[PDB]
Amino acid sequence: LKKIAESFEDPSSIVVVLEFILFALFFPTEFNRIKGDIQNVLLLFFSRWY
Amino acid sequence: TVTNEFASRFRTIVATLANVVNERAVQDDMQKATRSCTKQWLRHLETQFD
């Protein structure tokens, strides 16, 4: 994954989540090839929000 | 660790103070805008701390 610096302060940070989701739909294969590196971002999102 | 335990502790502290300031602000009928701004400030402190 090309690196994403995201702290997830604001709800607007949901954009990044959506980015991933879109990428998951348009490109399930490539998404699957990088999905752990994505989970590193989602874990920031989740620890911060949930 | 994926997550810094010190920083996570500061997140719980800021969560507690957040509901504290909130309870105070609703007690004193604060405008939603100022409330949102203190909350934003706290989230910023969490990021800076992390």
Which residues fall within 8 angstroms of residue B49, CB to CB, at 6 or more apart?
B7, B10
Q: Is A9 on the interface with B (CB under 8 A)?
A: yes
Site of tokens 């719980």: B12
How was this one solved?
A: cryo-EM
User: If 0-12 CB within 10 Å is exposed, 13-18 middle and 19+ buried, where does residue A22 land?
Assistant: exposed
Tokens standing for residue A5: 């610096």
* Count of CB atoms situated within 10 Å of the CB of B43: 18
User: Chain B contacts of A10, Cβ < 8 Å?
Assistant: 40, 43
Please answer yes or no on whether A9 and B2 come within 8 Å at the CB atom: no
Give resolution, Å, one decimal.
2.9
Question: Sign of torsion, CA B13 B14 B18 B19?
Answer: negative
Determine the Cα–Cα distance for residues A29 and A21; give it in Å rounded to an integer. 13
